Design an enzyme around this catalytic site. Structure first.
Site, PDB file in Angstrom:
ATOM      1  N   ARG A 146      11.627   2.802   3.768  1.00  0.00           N
ATOM      2  CA  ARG A 146      10.920   2.238   4.900  1.00  0.00           C
ATOM      3  C   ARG A 146      11.844   1.212   5.569  1.00  0.00           C
ATOM      4  NH1 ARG A 146       4.859   0.004   6.209  1.00  0.00           N
ATOM      5  NH2 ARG A 146       4.606   2.227   5.794  1.00  0.00           N
ATOM      6  N   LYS A 153      25.110 -10.937   0.099  1.00  0.00           N
ATOM      7  CA  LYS A 153      26.543 -10.721  -0.137  1.00  0.00           C
ATOM      8  C   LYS A 153      27.190  -9.755   0.880  1.00  0.00           C
ATOM      9  CE  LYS A 153      25.232 -10.665  -5.079  1.00  0.00           C
ATOM     10  NZ  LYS A 153      25.973 -11.407  -6.136  1.00  0.00           N
ATOM     11  N   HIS A 209       5.856   8.424  10.465  1.00  0.00           N
ATOM     12  CA  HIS A 209       5.356   8.172   9.115  1.00  0.00           C
ATOM     13  C   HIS A 209       4.832   9.548   8.633  1.00  0.00           C
ATOM     14  CE1 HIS A 209       3.879   6.149   5.674  1.00  0.00           C
ATOM     15  NE2 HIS A 209       3.338   5.086   6.237  1.00  0.00           N
ATOM     16  N   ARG A 217       0.782  -1.253   0.000  1.00  0.00           N
ATOM     17  CA  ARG A 217       0.000   0.000   0.000  1.00  0.00           C
ATOM     18  C   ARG A 217       0.815   1.306   0.000  1.00  0.00           C
ATOM     19  NH1 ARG A 217      -4.315  -1.253   2.239  1.00  0.00           N
ATOM     20  NH2 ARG A 217      -2.968  -1.895   3.980  1.00  0.00           N
ATOM     21  N   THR A 218       1.813   1.426   0.873  1.00  0.00           N
ATOM     22  CA  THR A 218       2.632   2.641   0.927  1.00  0.00           C
ATOM     23  C   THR A 218       3.531   2.735  -0.323  1.00  0.00           C
ATOM     24  OG1 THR A 218       2.589   2.848   3.352  1.00  0.00           O
ATOM     25  CG2 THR A 218       4.397   3.915   2.219  1.00  0.00           C
TER      26      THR A 218
END
Ligand SMILES: N[C@@H](CC(=O)O)C(=O)O
Lengths: 299, 318, 303
Positions: free
Chosen positions: C109, C88, C137, C65-66
Site C-alpha cells: 500500500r 538511512k 484497490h 483494517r486492510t
C-alpha cells in the site's frame, strides 16, 4: 507426557473481564492446567491445540510485557496472532477485529471501555487492563505464583503495597483472594491519598466479616508488615514503602516478594538475587496461566 | 538428517566474529547451502516448531529483524514482537520469561555484555553500536564462498565508513583469523579508516599469514584490477553528532576526502571474475548503474543471508 | 484439495494491480472459492495449504483494517507473515528487493499512484496492490463483488449508487471497473458534487462496455429519493478526510426492502450508526467476506 490438558469448561466462549467471575474451583482448575502446560513446554513438547485460531490485540495504551505475554501464550498453544494498532469509534474498531479474529485482548485507559466493547463484540474479549479498574488475568497469574511458590493460598498474610487507588492489579487480586480463599490478613500499605478504594472494599465486606479476614491499613512498611507477611506484593506509586536488601533482613525465611512490573525504586535491584524475589518467575507463571485461560476460553 | 546442526553453536550466544573457528564457518556454510536446496525445492522444514524468537531492538531496523523473522519462520519457528517504546536488565528478564532466542540490536557497544550477564536464553547480536555484526560476517563469507568458490587467496577491498562499520569490523576479524587472505585494501578517507582496536588484535595473524594490508583513500586502478571482492558500505550518519565540528568533518570526508563511488564506469576496470558486495542499505556510494552487472552480488547476498541465519538459528536451538 | 478448494489457475504467480486484469470467469471462480473457504473456516476446519510460505506487508501508509485482513487470510491458509514496518535513505526499489529476498508474496500500500509500477519492475515475487494513492484497490473491488453476490444473489442487473469522494476514492475506481467490465449492470448512480466526481480516466475506457451492455449512468449532487428507491446497492464512502449524501435511519425509509448498504470503511457521518442495526446494513459482513476473498486470492496466487 502422560498429563492431559482438560480445558476449564466454565470458561468456554466467555469473556474474561473481572476477578469476580471466577469460583474457587475455576481458579484451581486453571492452576493445575497451567502447571501441566508448564511441564510439557519445559520438556520440549509442542502443543497444537489452537491451530488456525487467531488472537488480536486492541491496545489503546501500550504494554509490551502484557501484549507479548499473551502472544507467547497463544503461540505456544499453536495459535496465531494478527496485529492491529490503533495509532474511528471503539465500536467500529471492535466490529473490524471481530470480522477475522477468534479472541480479542483489550487494554484501554478508560475503565468503562470494556462494557462498551462487550455490547458489540461477537468473540470473547480478554480484559488486559481497563483504566484504574481491573486486570483479571494478572490476579490469576499472581495467585498461581503464590500457590507454586508457597504451596498454599489459604492462611496467608499478604501486603498490597504502592498505588492501591489506581492499581488495577491490586484491585483484581484483593477481589480474587478474599472471595475465594481463607486469607488470614491483608496489609494495605499506601499513602492515605492512594489507599485501596471503597468501591473495592465494600462489596467484599460481607466475605471479610464471614471468613474473619483481617484488613490493616498502614502508610509504611512497618516491622510488623515485614515480620508477618508471607507475600509482599508491591507496585509503582517513599523511603517507608521501598523494599531493598536492608528491609528484607526483617522478612520471614519462607515468603515471596512479587511485583506485576514495571518497577521503579519501590523495589530495589539489591533484592533481585534473593531467593524470595519471585517477580521474574511471576512473568513465566504468567505465560502458563495465560495459556490455560486461552485454551479454556477457545476449546 | 540432511540438516545436521553445527554442534559447537548449541545454546550459545552469538556476539563476535572471534568466537568462530574455520571448521564452524564451513559447517555453517554447508548447512546453509543444504537448507537453500530444500527451501528452493519447496520443502517445508519443521525443525523449530514451538520455539519463539523475540527482538530487543533499542535502535530500530524493522529491516534487519524481518530477515531474522523470515529465517525463523522457514525453520517452522515462531515470532513474538516486543517494542522498547525501564532498565535494560528488566527488559531482558521479561523476554526471557517467554522466549527461546533473543535477537538484539543496540546503539551502545557495551550493552551486549550487560545483556549476556542477565540473559538466560541465547542472544544473537544483530549490531552493537559501531562494534560488531557477527552474523553479517558469516553470511558475507557464505556469499564469497558461493559466488567465487574459495575464500583463501582472495584480495578484498573494504570500502567506505570503516570507522563506524560494524560489518567490516566483523568481516575483517572473521577472514584474517580463519582464512589465508592474500591482500586487504582498506579504502576510506583518513577520518573513517579501520580502527586500531580492530587491526591491533589481528596484527599477529596478519604477520604470521603474510597478509598484505594497504590503506588508500581511493578506488585506484590497482584496487580495481586486483580485487576479487569489492565490499562497500554506507556512511553511518546515525553515529555522527552533525552539530560538532569533528563529526561534520568525518561526515564530509566520505565524499570530500575519498574517491570511492562504484558505478558502471569504475566497473570497466574490475576483473571478470569478482563480486561487488554491500551489507545494505546503501546510498550514493553504490550506483544503481551497477545493479544489472552479473558481478553485482549485493542482492544475492541478502538471500544467502536468510539461509545463513537459518543455519545459525537451527544450530543455536537444536 | 482440488475438489473442495481448487485454486483459480489464471492467478498463479501473478501480481494483482488492477480490476482490469480479471475476466468474468476469474471473478466467479474467486467467488466460489471464497464461499468454499468460508464454509470450511466456519465449520472449524484448519487449512494447511500455504505452510512455509511468507507474506510480507509493505505499507507506506497505514490501514490496520486492510493489513489485518490480509494477515488473517494468510494465517488461515496455514501461511506465515513477516511483520515489516516502514516507520538511512534506502530507496523504494531496494526495500522491495530486500523483502523479495525472503518472501513469497508482497502486499503493498502506497500514497503515490506510480509506486506499484516501480515495485513491479524490480520484484521477483507477486505483489498485491492494497491501494496506490488515488488509483485502485483491486482486492477491495473483488471482496465488494463477493459481498453483492452473496447478499443479493446476483450481480448482473443491479442498480448501484457509488456515493462520496469519487475523484480520490480508489475503492470506487476499482469497483466501477470490475462491475461494468464483467457484468451486465443495469444502472450506476454517481452521487457526488462535480468537484469530487468519478474521473473521466475511469469512465472513458469503460465506453465500449457501457454501450455494448446498455448500462445506464447518471450523476447526482445529492442522494435523491430516486437513487434511494431504485438502488439495489448503496455503496458509500467518506466525502472528505457532507451536504445531502448522509444515509441514516430516516433516509433508509425510502430504500427498497431488499437491498444492501456497503462502505469499505472507515466511515464519518455519511453513514449514521442509526443504520447499523438494519438487516440491509452489510458493511460489517463486507469485512468478513473480505477475509475469505483474500484467502481465495492468496491461495490462487501461490498454489
Ligand atoms: N545494515 C548494516 C549496514 C548499514 O546499516 O549500513 C548494519 O546494520 O550495520
Amino acid at each position: 507426557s502422560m498429563l492431559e490438558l482438560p480445558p476449564v469448561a466454565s470458561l468456554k466462549g466467555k469473556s474474561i473481564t473481572s476477578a469476580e467471575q471466577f469460583s474457587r474451583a475455576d481458579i484451581y482448575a486453571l492452576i493445575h492446567l497451567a502447571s501441566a502446560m508448564q511441564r510439557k513446554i519445559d520438556a520440549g513438547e509442542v502443543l497444537n491445540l489452537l491451530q488456525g485460531r487467531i488472537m488480536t490485540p486492541l491496545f489503546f495504551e501500550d504494554s509490551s510485557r502484557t501484549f507479548s505475554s499473551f502472544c507467547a501464550a497463544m503461540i505456544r498453544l499453536g495459535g496465531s496472532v494478527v496485529n492491529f494498532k490503533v495509532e474511528e469509534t471503539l465500536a467500529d474498531t471492535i466490529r473490524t477485529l471481530d470480522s477475522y479474529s477468534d479472541v480479542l485482548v483489550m487494554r484501554h485507559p478508560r475503565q468503562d471501555a470494556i462494557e462498551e466493547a462487550l455490547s458489540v463484540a461477537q468473540h470473547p474479549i480478554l480484559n488486559a487492563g481497563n483504566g484504574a479498574g481491573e486486570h483479571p488475568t494478572q490476579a490469576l497469574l499472581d495467585t498461581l505464583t503464590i500457590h507454586s511458590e508457597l504451596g498454599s493460598v489459604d492462611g496467608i498474610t499478604i501486603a498490597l503495597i504502592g498505588d492501591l487507588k489506581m492499581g488495577r492489579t491490586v484491585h483484581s487480586l484483593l477481589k480474587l483472594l478474599v472471595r475465594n480463599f481463607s486469607i488470614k490478613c491483608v496489609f494495605l500499605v499506601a499513602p492515605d491519598a492512594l489507599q485501596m478504594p471503597q468501591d473495592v472494599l465494600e462489596p467484599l465486606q460481607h466475605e471479610i466479616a464471614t471468613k474473619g479476614v483481617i484488613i490493616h491499613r498502614t502508610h509504611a512498611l512497618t516491622d510488623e508488615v515485614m515480620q508477618k507477611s508471607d507475600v509482599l506484593y508491591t507496585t509503582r506509586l517513599k523511603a517507608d514503602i521501598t523494599i531493598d536488601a536492608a528491609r528484607m533482613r526483617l522478612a520471614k525465611e519462607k515468603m515471596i516478594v512479587m511485583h506485576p512490573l514495571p518497577r521503579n525504586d519501590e523495589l530495589s535491584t539489591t533484592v533481585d538475587a534473593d531467593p524470595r524475589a519471585a517477580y521474574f518467575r511471576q512473568m513465566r507463571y504468567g505465560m502458563f496461566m495465560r495459556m490455560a485461560i486461552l485454551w479454556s476460553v477457545l476449546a
